[PDB]
């Protein structure tokens, strides 16, 4: 097979970061999505794949890793078939959309799969702080790559099967997403614990004090983040107040500045000591048999961040930082 040489060739290129604007203005035809994607997906696949091969042999050769490696190889090849094929012919384009579907689905399990490699590495070689920085280093990169691949694939399959533009909403009402996520967390909350804290939203539109706040974002990404955060702050809030009678609400503030859109979630769940805050964002230190770390990646993906500050004995604030303007929302992609 050619697999290694394909990887060699396409890993000389660099992934091409797109902006939400550049995403938005796409439909400027499938032909163009097609010809773009058949080059770029191979690039992004190759780049992470060569980085996977920089992993030391004791990691490199466990079942978990070798398993995802096989998936990425089959994908690269699945996409290969379409290099000499041409557009104008509408079955080329249709067979492609189908190929993009199969790939996305094949990869639905990378998270639990990799997570398994961390566990067998913990039990096999130790949980030292160095291993931890490499695992952290490698996975932050690996997942992020992975997210952007999905982003491309979803932009294609959804548009070339209007208010929305695929996975993007150009009029994303943030509190709308905040509540939905809240409502879903509460449901799970009311089931397991049969109590649940309330929600207070407040907006602060700096430039336009009385205007409801809208942005251009990918709302499922935003849902995902807010969801984990609500889960966590509910869980804490309940268990911290099980001998008490009052259950403190979860206050969220959504704030819009000249370049930031920022979302704080404040809970009175009894806090976490400074010492333990790193552990929460660590893939290794929070592995037992998404979480915060993956939700963070989503934040980073379009030049955002997601941060935590607690006060032990009281509560935790968690902040989602997003870029306010489509121009600033460029993809953050790892490169080899
Ligand atoms: C399966 C995935 C999650 C996984 C699980 C476990 C690991 C562990 O990765 C390590 C551990 C130790 C070292 C030191 C070393 O030998 N350095 C040599 C070069 N200085 C490097 C790496 Cl990349 C990575 C990825
Ligand atoms: C006594 C109850 N105490 C907590 O459960 C502490 N707890 C926090 O305080 C906390 C942490 C993260 C967060 O975004 C919000 C929080 O309130 C916490 C919540 C979720 C979590 O998942 C692993 C770990 C810790
Ligand atoms: Mg932090």
Swiss-Prot record:
A Pfam family per the record: BCDHK_Adom3
CDD domains on file: HATPase_PDK-like (cd16929)
Free-text tissue specificity from the UniProt record: Expressed in many tissues, with the highest level in heart and skeletal muscle, intermediate levels in brain, kidney, pancreas and liver, and low levels in placenta and lung.
Gene Ontology CC terms: cytosol; mitochondrial matrix; mitochondrion; nucleoplasm; pyruvate dehydrogenase complex
GO BP term, example: intrinsic apoptotic signaling pathway by p53 class mediator
Record flagged with keyword Lipoprotein: no
Top-rank taxon, per record: Eukaryota
Entry keyword ATP-binding: yes
Catalytic activity entry: L-seryl-[pyruvate dehydrogenase E1 alpha subunit] + ATP = O-phospho-L-seryl-[pyruvate dehydrogenase E1 alpha subunit] + ADP + H(+)
Positions bearing Phosphotyrosine: 192-193
Gene3D superfamilies named among the record's database cross-references: Alpha-ketoacid/pyruvate dehydrogenase kinase, N-terminal domain (1.20.140.20), Histidine kinase-like ATPase, C-terminal domain (3.30.565.10)
Keywords (A to Z) from UniProt: ATP-binding, Kinase, Mitochondrion, Nucleotide-binding, Phosphoprotein, Transferase, Transit peptide
EC number: 2.7.11.2
Residues of the Histidine kinase domain: 119-326
InterPro entries with a match to the protein in the record: AK/P_DHK_N_sf (IPR036784), BCDHK/PDK_N (IPR018955), BCKD/PDK (IPR039028), HATPase_C_sf (IPR036890), His_kinase_dom (IPR005467)
Compartment(s): Mitochondrion matrix
Binding of ATP, residues: 228-235, 267, 286-287
Record text on activity regulation: Activity is enhanced by binding to the pyruvate dehydrogenase subunit DLAT. Inhibited by ADP and pyruvate; these compounds interfere with DLAT binding and thereby inhibit kinase activity. Inhibited by dichloroacetate. Inhibited by AZD7545; this compound interferes with DLAT binding and thereby inhibits kinase activity.
Predominant localisation class: mitochondrion
GO MF terms, alphabetically ordered: ATP binding; protein homodimerization activity; protein kinase activity; pyruvate dehydrogenase (acetyl-transferring) kinase activity
Reported function: Kinase that plays a key role in the regulation of glucose and fatty acid metabolism and homeostasis via phosphorylation of the pyruvate dehydrogenase subunits PDHA1 and PDHA2. This inhibits pyruvate dehydrogenase activity, and thereby regulates metabolite flux through the tricarboxylic acid cycle, down-regulates aerobic respiration and inhibits the formation of acetyl-coenzyme A from pyruvate. Inhibition of pyruvate dehydrogenase decreases glucose utilization and increases fat metabolism. Mediates cellular responses to insulin.
Family: Belongs to the PDK/BCKDK protein kinase family.
Assembly behavior: Homodimer, and heterodimer with PDK1. Interacts with the pyruvate dehydrogenase complex subunit DLAT, and is part of the multimeric pyruvate dehydrogenase complex that contains multiple copies of pyruvate dehydrogenase (E1), dihydrolipoamide acetyltransferase (DLAT, E2) and lipoamide dehydrogenase (DLD, E3).
Protein name according to UniProt: [Pyruvate dehydrogenase (acetyl-transferring)] kinase isozyme 2, mitochondrial
Source lineage: Eukaryota, Metazoa, Chordata, Craniata, Vertebrata
């Amino acid at each position: 097979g050619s697999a290694p040489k394909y990887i060699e060739h396409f890993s000389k290129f660099s992934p091409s970061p797109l902006s939400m604007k550049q995403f938005l203005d796409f439909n400027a035809c499938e032909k163009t999505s097609f010809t773009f994607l058949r080059q770029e997906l191979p690039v992004r696949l190759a780049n992470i794949m060569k980085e996977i091969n920089l992993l030391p042999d004791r990691v490199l050769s466990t079942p978990s890793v070798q398993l995802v490696q096989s998936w990425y190889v089959q994908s690269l090849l699945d996409i290969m078939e379409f290099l000499d094929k041409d557009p104008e012919d509408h079955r080329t384009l249709s067979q492609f959309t189908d190929a993009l579907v199969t790939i996305r689905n094949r990869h639905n399990d990378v998270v639990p799969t990799m997570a398994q490699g961390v566990l067998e590495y913990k039990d096999t070689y130790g949980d030292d702080p160095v291993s931890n920085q490499n695992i952290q280093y490698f996975l932050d990169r690996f997942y992020l790559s992975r997210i952007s691949i999905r982003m491309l694939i979803n932009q294609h399959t959804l548009i070339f099967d209007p208010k929305h533009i695929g996975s993007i909403d150009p009029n994303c009402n943030v509190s709308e997403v905040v509540k939905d996520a809240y409502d879903m967390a509460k449901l799970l909350c009311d089931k397991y614990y049969m109590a649940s804290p309330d929600l207070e939203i407040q907006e602060i539109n700096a430039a336009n004090s009385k205007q409801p706040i809208h942005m251009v974002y990918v709302p499922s990404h935003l849902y995902h983040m807010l969801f984990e955060l609500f889960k966590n702050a509910m869980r804490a809030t309940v268990e911290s107040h099980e001998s008490s009678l009052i259950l403190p609400p979860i206050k969220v503030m959504v704030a819009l500045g000249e370049e930031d859109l920022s979302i704080k979630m404040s809970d009175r769940g009894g806090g976490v000591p400074l010492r333990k805050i790193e552990r929460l964002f660590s893939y290794m230190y929070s592995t037992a048999p998404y979480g915060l770390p993956i939700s963070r990646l989503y934040a980073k993906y379009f030049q955002g961040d997601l941060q935590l500050f607690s006060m032990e004995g009281f509560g935790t604030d968690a902040v989602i930082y997003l870029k306010a303007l489509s121009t600033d929302s460029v993809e953050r992609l790892p490169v080899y």
